[PDB]
């Protein structure tokens, strides 16, 4: 409980939702020989649904007045309640992968800018160079913080063109 939200493993509405959705799939089953391809597909679907509902209850997600899992988007109020996997950990994971792709693209631009025909190396990518830079982009937190502490990441506005006010 973090804000009037009982753990889904306790909420009765969550188990009721599990029950109802499984009962619907059972009603769909009761029409085929339990060895035909449709019957096997339905049985696999029911197994998948049961696995999902047990997995959600195991991880202690919070269910509301209705039986639906809720997430917490405040560090500290999710780290002292064991719910950091809801937003904070995926926040780190995204920020990392997004930065990886962005840094790989940025370094590819800065690498093909200093060539003979920079406008040509954007529509006909150099795949070995792109792949090398894609591999080097994994350390992007380190390299980006190095360039910020170095001052080489950014450009002074006296050199960027601007509009006539």
């Amino acid at each position: 409980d973090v804000a009037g939200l009982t753990p889904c493993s306790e909420s009765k509405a969550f188990a009721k939702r599990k029950k109802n959705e499984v009962k619907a799939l059972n009603k769909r089953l009761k029409n085929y020989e339990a060895d035909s391809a449709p019957a096997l597909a339905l049985k696999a679907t029911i197994a998948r649904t049961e696995a999902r509902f047990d997995k959600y209850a195991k991880q202690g997600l919070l269910c509301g007045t209705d039986g639906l899992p809720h997430l917490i988007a405040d560090p500290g109020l999710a780290l002292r309640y064991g719910h950091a996997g809801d937003v904070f950990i995926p926040t780190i994971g995204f920020i990392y992968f997004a930065g990886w792709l962005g840094y790989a693209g940025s370094k590819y631009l800065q690498a093909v800018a200093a060539t003979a025909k920079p406008i040509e190396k954007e529509i006909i990518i150099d795949v070995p160079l792109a792949w090398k830079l894609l591999w080097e982009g994994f350390g992007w937190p380190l390299r980006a913080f190095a360039e910020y502490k170095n001052g080489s990441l950014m450009e002074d506005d006296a050199k960027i063109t601007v509009s006539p006010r």
Binding site: Q59, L61, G85, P90, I124, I125, V127
Partner: protein, 41 residues
Amino acid sequence: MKDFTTYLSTAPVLTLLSVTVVAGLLIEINRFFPDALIAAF
């Protein structure tokens, strides 16, 4: 060959290839690790 590989490096083909690779990867991850709502480690 060299020109064929140059064609395979063009933005229309390489973009489509990379989107296909990433899509296939996400599809595989969701096929083996489905219904993952949180980063449970």
